[PDB]
Short mmCIF file of all heavy atoms in Angstrom, two decimals:
data_model
loop_
_atom_site.label_atom_id
_atom_site.label_comp_id
_atom_site.label_asym_id
_atom_site.label_seq_id
_atom_site.Cartn_x
_atom_site.Cartn_y
_atom_site.Cartn_z
N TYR A 1 22.84 -180.85 -97.73
CA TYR A 1 22.76 -181.16 -96.30
C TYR A 1 21.69 -182.44 -96.07
O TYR A 1 20.73 -182.33 -96.82
CB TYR A 1 22.17 -180.06 -95.37
CG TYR A 1 23.13 -179.02 -94.98
CD1 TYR A 1 23.37 -178.01 -95.74
CD2 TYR A 1 23.80 -179.06 -93.67
CE1 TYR A 1 24.33 -176.84 -95.36
CE2 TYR A 1 24.75 -178.14 -93.23
CZ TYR A 1 24.90 -177.06 -94.15
OH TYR A 1 25.85 -176.10 -93.71
N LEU A 2 22.01 -183.36 -95.18
CA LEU A 2 21.14 -184.35 -94.78
C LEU A 2 20.61 -184.27 -93.43
O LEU A 2 21.48 -183.85 -92.53
CB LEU A 2 21.76 -185.76 -95.16
CG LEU A 2 22.03 -185.86 -96.57
CD1 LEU A 2 23.08 -186.89 -97.06
CD2 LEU A 2 20.63 -186.30 -97.32
N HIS A 3 19.40 -184.42 -93.19
CA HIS A 3 18.76 -184.29 -91.88
C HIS A 3 18.65 -185.60 -91.17
O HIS A 3 18.42 -186.60 -91.70
CB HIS A 3 17.49 -183.42 -91.87
CG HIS A 3 17.57 -182.12 -92.57
ND1 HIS A 3 18.37 -181.23 -91.93
CD2 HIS A 3 17.14 -181.56 -93.68
CE1 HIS A 3 18.39 -179.97 -92.61
NE2 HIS A 3 17.57 -180.35 -93.79
N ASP A 4 18.78 -185.39 -89.79
CA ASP A 4 18.28 -186.50 -88.92
C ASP A 4 16.88 -186.22 -88.47
O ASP A 4 16.60 -185.51 -87.49
CB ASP A 4 19.30 -186.50 -87.72
CG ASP A 4 19.02 -187.66 -86.78
OD1 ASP A 4 17.71 -188.18 -86.62
OD2 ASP A 4 20.01 -188.17 -86.14
N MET A 5 15.94 -186.78 -89.31
CA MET A 5 14.52 -186.41 -88.93
C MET A 5 13.92 -186.91 -87.59
O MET A 5 13.36 -186.15 -86.95
CB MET A 5 13.58 -186.88 -90.00
CG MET A 5 13.84 -186.14 -91.38
SD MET A 5 13.79 -184.42 -91.42
CE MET A 5 12.05 -184.12 -90.95
N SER A 6 14.47 -188.01 -87.18
CA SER A 6 13.83 -188.49 -85.95
C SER A 6 14.32 -187.67 -84.78
O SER A 6 13.59 -187.42 -83.87
CB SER A 6 14.20 -190.12 -85.81
OG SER A 6 15.26 -190.35 -86.50
N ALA A 7 15.62 -187.36 -84.81
CA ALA A 7 16.24 -186.57 -83.71
C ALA A 7 15.51 -185.30 -83.71
O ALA A 7 14.89 -184.77 -82.74
CB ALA A 7 17.76 -186.43 -84.01
N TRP A 8 15.26 -184.57 -84.81
CA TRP A 8 14.65 -183.39 -84.88
C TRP A 8 13.28 -183.39 -84.41
O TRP A 8 12.86 -182.58 -83.55
CB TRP A 8 14.58 -182.91 -86.43
CG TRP A 8 14.09 -181.54 -86.61
CD1 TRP A 8 12.88 -181.28 -87.30
CD2 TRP A 8 14.48 -180.21 -86.19
NE1 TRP A 8 12.58 -179.86 -87.42
CE2 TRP A 8 13.48 -179.30 -86.74
CE3 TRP A 8 15.64 -179.82 -85.61
CZ2 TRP A 8 13.62 -177.88 -86.51
CZ3 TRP A 8 15.68 -178.24 -85.37
CH2 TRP A 8 14.73 -177.42 -85.83
N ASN A 9 12.42 -184.38 -84.67
CA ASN A 9 11.21 -184.67 -84.12
C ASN A 9 11.05 -184.85 -82.57
O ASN A 9 9.95 -184.82 -82.01
CB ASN A 9 10.27 -185.68 -84.87
CG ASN A 9 10.20 -185.31 -86.38
OD1 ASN A 9 10.35 -184.10 -86.82
ND2 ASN A 9 9.91 -186.42 -87.18
N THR A 10 12.13 -185.21 -81.94
CA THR A 10 12.06 -185.27 -80.38
C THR A 10 12.06 -183.92 -79.76
O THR A 10 11.65 -183.71 -78.55
CB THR A 10 13.18 -186.27 -79.86
OG1 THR A 10 14.42 -185.45 -79.61
CG2 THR A 10 13.49 -187.38 -80.58
N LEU A 11 12.47 -182.93 -80.57
CA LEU A 11 12.22 -181.54 -80.10
C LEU A 11 10.87 -181.11 -79.97
O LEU A 11 10.15 -181.56 -80.76
CB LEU A 11 13.03 -180.48 -80.60
CG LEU A 11 14.62 -180.53 -80.21
CD1 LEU A 11 15.24 -181.84 -80.19
CD2 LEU A 11 15.33 -179.52 -81.34
N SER A 12 10.46 -180.33 -78.90
CA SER A 12 9.00 -179.64 -79.00
C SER A 12 9.27 -178.62 -80.10
O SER A 12 10.44 -178.16 -80.41
CB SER A 12 8.91 -178.97 -77.61
OG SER A 12 9.75 -178.04 -77.48
N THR A 13 8.15 -178.06 -80.50
CA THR A 13 8.12 -176.90 -81.46
C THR A 13 8.75 -175.63 -80.95
O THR A 13 9.53 -175.08 -81.70
CB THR A 13 6.66 -176.56 -81.87
OG1 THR A 13 6.11 -177.68 -82.38
CG2 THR A 13 6.57 -175.39 -82.81
N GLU A 14 8.61 -175.44 -79.62
CA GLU A 14 9.30 -174.28 -79.00
C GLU A 14 10.87 -174.40 -79.03
O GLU A 14 11.54 -173.35 -79.36
CB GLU A 14 8.81 -174.05 -77.63
CG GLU A 14 7.38 -173.54 -77.57
CD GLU A 14 6.22 -174.56 -78.00
OE1 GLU A 14 6.51 -175.85 -77.89
OE2 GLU A 14 5.24 -174.06 -78.43
N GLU A 15 11.26 -175.59 -78.83
CA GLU A 15 12.73 -175.87 -79.01
C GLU A 15 13.28 -175.64 -80.28
O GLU A 15 14.33 -175.00 -80.55
CB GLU A 15 13.03 -177.37 -78.47
CG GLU A 15 13.65 -177.51 -77.08
CD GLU A 15 13.29 -178.75 -76.54
OE1 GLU A 15 12.71 -179.79 -77.08
OE2 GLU A 15 13.66 -178.97 -75.20
N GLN A 16 12.43 -176.04 -81.28
CA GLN A 16 12.84 -175.91 -82.68
C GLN A 16 12.85 -174.52 -83.11
O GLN A 16 13.79 -174.12 -83.88
CB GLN A 16 11.98 -176.81 -83.55
CG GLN A 16 12.05 -178.32 -83.38
CD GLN A 16 11.07 -179.00 -84.51
OE1 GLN A 16 10.24 -178.36 -85.05
NE2 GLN A 16 11.32 -180.33 -84.66
N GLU A 17 11.93 -173.72 -82.64
CA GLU A 17 11.90 -172.34 -82.79
C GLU A 17 13.11 -171.68 -82.23
O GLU A 17 13.77 -170.76 -82.79
CB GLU A 17 10.61 -171.75 -82.20
CG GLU A 17 9.52 -171.87 -83.11
CD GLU A 17 8.13 -171.82 -82.47
OE1 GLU A 17 8.10 -171.65 -81.30
OE2 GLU A 17 7.02 -172.04 -83.15
N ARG A 18 13.51 -172.16 -80.91
CA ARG A 18 14.72 -171.56 -80.29
C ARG A 18 16.10 -171.87 -81.25
O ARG A 18 16.92 -171.08 -81.43
CB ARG A 18 14.91 -171.98 -78.89
CG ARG A 18 14.11 -170.98 -78.00
CD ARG A 18 14.27 -171.41 -76.54
NE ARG A 18 12.94 -171.89 -76.02
CZ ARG A 18 12.61 -173.25 -75.69
NH1 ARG A 18 13.61 -174.09 -75.99
NH2 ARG A 18 11.48 -173.56 -75.29
N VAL A 19 16.12 -173.01 -81.79
CA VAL A 19 17.26 -173.45 -82.68
C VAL A 19 17.14 -172.51 -84.06
O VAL A 19 18.21 -172.02 -84.41
CB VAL A 19 17.02 -174.79 -83.17
CG1 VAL A 19 17.97 -175.15 -84.45
CG2 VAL A 19 17.42 -175.75 -81.99
N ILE A 20 15.96 -172.24 -84.57
CA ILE A 20 15.95 -171.46 -85.81
C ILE A 20 16.04 -170.01 -85.61
O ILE A 20 16.89 -169.25 -86.26
CB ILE A 20 14.70 -171.79 -86.65
CG1 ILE A 20 14.70 -173.34 -87.00
CG2 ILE A 20 14.58 -170.90 -87.88
CD1 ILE A 20 15.87 -173.66 -88.00
N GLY A 21 15.15 -169.43 -84.75
CA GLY A 21 15.07 -167.94 -84.49
C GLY A 21 13.85 -167.46 -84.92
O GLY A 21 13.65 -166.21 -84.94
N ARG A 22 12.85 -168.16 -85.45
CA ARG A 22 11.59 -167.83 -85.86
C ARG A 22 10.56 -168.80 -85.49
O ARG A 22 10.82 -169.91 -84.98
CB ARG A 22 11.59 -167.57 -87.32
CG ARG A 22 12.85 -166.95 -87.89
CD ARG A 22 12.76 -166.64 -89.39
NE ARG A 22 11.58 -165.72 -89.70
CZ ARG A 22 11.52 -164.39 -89.87
NH1 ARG A 22 12.77 -163.71 -90.02
NH2 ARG A 22 10.47 -163.84 -90.26
N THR A 23 9.29 -168.21 -85.37
CA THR A 23 8.22 -169.20 -85.05
C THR A 23 7.92 -170.17 -86.20
O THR A 23 8.08 -169.84 -87.43
CB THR A 23 6.85 -168.58 -84.49
OG1 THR A 23 6.48 -167.64 -85.62
CG2 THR A 23 7.19 -167.66 -83.32
N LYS A 24 7.55 -171.44 -85.90
CA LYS A 24 7.56 -172.46 -87.09
C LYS A 24 6.47 -172.17 -87.99
O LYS A 24 6.57 -171.83 -89.22
CB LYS A 24 7.40 -173.74 -86.28
CG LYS A 24 7.45 -174.93 -87.37
CD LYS A 24 7.85 -176.34 -86.68
CE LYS A 24 8.24 -177.33 -87.79
NZ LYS A 24 8.38 -178.55 -87.11
N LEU A 25 5.02 -172.30 -87.51
CA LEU A 25 3.96 -172.09 -88.48
C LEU A 25 3.89 -170.75 -89.03
O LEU A 25 3.89 -170.58 -90.30
CB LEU A 25 2.68 -172.52 -88.00
CG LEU A 25 1.50 -172.10 -88.94
CD1 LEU A 25 1.50 -172.64 -90.37
CD2 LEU A 25 0.04 -172.09 -88.24
N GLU A 26 3.95 -169.66 -88.16
CA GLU A 26 3.69 -168.34 -88.61
C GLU A 26 4.98 -167.53 -89.25
O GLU A 26 4.88 -166.56 -89.91
CB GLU A 26 3.06 -167.43 -87.45
CG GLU A 26 1.70 -166.70 -87.79
CD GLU A 26 1.27 -165.59 -86.91
OE1 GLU A 26 1.86 -165.42 -85.65
OE2 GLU A 26 0.34 -164.83 -87.19
N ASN A 27 6.10 -168.17 -89.12
CA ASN A 27 7.44 -167.65 -89.78
C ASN A 27 7.65 -166.19 -89.22
O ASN A 27 8.25 -165.25 -89.92
CB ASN A 27 7.23 -167.73 -91.34
CG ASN A 27 8.53 -167.20 -91.81
OD1 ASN A 27 9.62 -167.35 -91.49
ND2 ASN A 27 8.34 -166.39 -93.01
N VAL A 28 7.15 -165.96 -88.04
CA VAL A 28 7.46 -164.62 -87.29
C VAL A 28 8.78 -164.64 -86.55
O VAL A 28 9.08 -165.49 -85.77
CB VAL A 28 6.38 -164.20 -86.37
CG1 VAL A 28 6.69 -163.01 -85.64
CG2 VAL A 28 5.07 -164.18 -87.12
N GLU A 29 9.72 -163.67 -86.79
CA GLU A 29 10.99 -163.70 -86.08
C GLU A 29 10.68 -163.51 -84.54
O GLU A 29 9.83 -162.64 -84.14
CB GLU A 29 11.80 -162.40 -86.45
CG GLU A 29 13.03 -162.27 -85.79
CD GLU A 29 14.27 -161.76 -86.54
OE1 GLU A 29 14.28 -161.80 -87.84
OE2 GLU A 29 15.17 -161.25 -86.07
N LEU A 30 11.36 -164.33 -83.74
CA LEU A 30 11.44 -164.26 -82.32
C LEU A 30 12.05 -162.77 -81.81
O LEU A 30 12.96 -162.34 -82.53
CB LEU A 30 12.29 -165.33 -81.69
CG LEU A 30 11.82 -166.58 -81.03
CD1 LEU A 30 10.56 -167.13 -81.57
CD2 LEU A 30 12.93 -167.76 -81.33
N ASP A 31 11.46 -162.22 -80.77
CA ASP A 31 11.90 -160.88 -80.43
C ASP A 31 13.30 -160.94 -79.65
O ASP A 31 13.58 -162.13 -79.25
CB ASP A 31 10.78 -160.10 -79.54
CG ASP A 31 9.99 -160.89 -78.61
OD1 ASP A 31 10.57 -161.92 -78.11
OD2 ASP A 31 8.88 -160.67 -78.35
N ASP A 32 13.97 -159.90 -79.53
CA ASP A 32 15.38 -159.87 -79.03
C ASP A 32 15.59 -160.68 -77.70
O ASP A 32 16.66 -161.42 -77.69
CB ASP A 32 15.85 -158.44 -78.93
CG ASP A 32 16.38 -157.80 -80.34
OD1 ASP A 32 15.36 -157.33 -81.10
OD2 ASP A 32 17.45 -157.97 -80.60
N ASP A 33 14.76 -160.41 -76.74
CA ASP A 33 14.87 -161.20 -75.46
C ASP A 33 14.63 -162.59 -75.55
O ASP A 33 14.90 -163.33 -74.53
CB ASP A 33 14.16 -160.37 -74.38
CG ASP A 33 12.66 -160.45 -74.64
OD1 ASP A 33 12.03 -161.61 -74.61
OD2 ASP A 33 11.95 -159.46 -74.83
N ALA A 34 13.98 -163.20 -76.47
CA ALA A 34 13.80 -164.67 -76.57
C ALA A 34 14.67 -165.31 -77.61
O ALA A 34 14.53 -166.59 -77.77
CB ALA A 34 12.34 -165.07 -76.74
N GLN A 35 15.37 -164.57 -78.45
CA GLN A 35 16.28 -165.06 -79.42
C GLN A 35 17.50 -165.51 -78.78
O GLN A 35 18.38 -164.89 -78.36
CB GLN A 35 16.72 -163.89 -80.35
CG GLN A 35 15.90 -163.67 -81.67
CD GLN A 35 16.21 -164.76 -82.71
OE1 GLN A 35 15.84 -164.50 -83.83
NE2 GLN A 35 16.97 -165.82 -82.43
N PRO A 36 17.72 -166.90 -78.75
CA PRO A 36 19.06 -167.47 -78.21
C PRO A 36 20.20 -166.86 -79.01
O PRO A 36 20.14 -166.52 -80.09
CB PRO A 36 18.89 -168.91 -78.33
CG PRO A 36 17.47 -169.25 -78.68
CD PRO A 36 16.89 -167.99 -79.13
N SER A 37 21.44 -166.77 -78.41
CA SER A 37 22.55 -166.10 -78.98
C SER A 37 23.22 -167.06 -80.02
O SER A 37 24.06 -166.65 -80.92
CB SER A 37 23.55 -165.71 -78.13
OG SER A 37 24.17 -166.91 -77.44
N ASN A 38 22.79 -168.31 -80.04
CA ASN A 38 23.31 -169.26 -80.93
C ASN A 38 22.17 -169.76 -81.97
O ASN A 38 22.31 -170.72 -82.65
CB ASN A 38 23.89 -170.52 -80.24
CG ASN A 38 22.88 -171.29 -79.33
OD1 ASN A 38 21.81 -170.78 -78.99
ND2 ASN A 38 23.25 -172.49 -78.91
N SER A 39 20.94 -169.07 -82.03
CA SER A 39 20.03 -169.38 -83.06
C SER A 39 20.65 -169.18 -84.37
O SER A 39 21.52 -168.49 -84.60
CB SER A 39 18.81 -168.39 -82.94
OG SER A 39 18.96 -167.11 -83.53
N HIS A 40 20.08 -169.97 -85.42
CA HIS A 40 20.64 -169.91 -86.78
C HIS A 40 20.57 -168.54 -87.25
O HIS A 40 21.56 -168.17 -87.96
CB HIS A 40 19.75 -170.87 -87.52
CG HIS A 40 20.09 -170.81 -88.95
ND1 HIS A 40 21.08 -171.77 -89.49
CD2 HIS A 40 19.50 -170.32 -90.03
CE1 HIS A 40 21.10 -171.65 -90.74
NE2 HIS A 40 20.18 -170.73 -91.07
N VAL A 41 19.39 -167.81 -86.86
CA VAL A 41 19.37 -166.45 -87.40
C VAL A 41 20.41 -165.47 -86.79
O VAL A 41 20.88 -164.67 -87.49
CB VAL A 41 17.85 -166.00 -87.15
CG1 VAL A 41 17.75 -164.36 -87.19
CG2 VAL A 41 16.89 -166.56 -88.11
N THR A 42 20.57 -165.51 -85.41
CA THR A 42 21.55 -164.67 -84.85
C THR A 42 23.02 -164.86 -85.45
O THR A 42 23.56 -163.93 -86.01
CB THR A 42 21.69 -164.89 -83.34
OG1 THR A 42 20.49 -164.62 -82.70
CG2 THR A 42 22.77 -164.07 -82.69
N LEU A 43 23.31 -166.13 -85.53
CA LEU A 43 24.69 -166.49 -86.02
C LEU A 43 24.83 -166.05 -87.60
O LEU A 43 25.93 -165.64 -87.98
CB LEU A 43 24.89 -168.02 -86.04
CG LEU A 43 25.02 -168.48 -84.59
CD1 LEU A 43 24.86 -170.01 -84.36
CD2 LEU A 43 26.32 -167.99 -83.96
N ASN A 44 23.81 -166.02 -88.34
CA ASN A 44 23.84 -165.71 -89.63
C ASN A 44 23.46 -164.21 -89.91
O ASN A 44 23.28 -163.81 -91.03
CB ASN A 44 22.87 -166.60 -90.44
CG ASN A 44 23.51 -167.99 -90.69
OD1 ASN A 44 22.85 -168.98 -90.59
ND2 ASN A 44 24.76 -167.99 -91.12
N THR A 45 23.39 -163.45 -88.86
CA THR A 45 23.38 -162.01 -88.97
C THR A 45 24.74 -161.43 -88.92
O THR A 45 25.45 -161.57 -87.86
CB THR A 45 22.37 -161.37 -87.90
OG1 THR A 45 21.20 -161.79 -88.06
CG2 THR A 45 22.41 -159.77 -87.91
#
């Protein structure tokens, strides 16, 4: 995979967390009610 770094950096950290499914620095999984249904984590469960 190749990343578009600049595009990624226009997101706030919270947005990036919503994309992934976990908090960025602490690597803690977002709880059920704040996990978008299209987070990388939800999709890959």
Side-chain angles (χ1 to χ4, degrees):
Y1 282 88
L2 293 156
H3 298 294
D4 185 332
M5 299 299 303
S6 26
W8 182 247
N9 303 340
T10 80
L11 281 47
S12 63
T13 303
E14 291 68 26
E15 255 152 8
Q16 292 186 344
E17 283 159 356
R18 276 176 249 106
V19 171
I20 297 294
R22 313 186 61 101
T23 56
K24 189 166 190 182
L25 170 65
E26 237 195 345
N27 180 38
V28 172
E29 178 148 340
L30 263 19
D31 40 33
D32 283 85
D33 66 64
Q35 267 283 192
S37 68
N38 60 346
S39 79
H40 176 88
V41 164
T42 297
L43 293 167
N44 282 137
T45 296

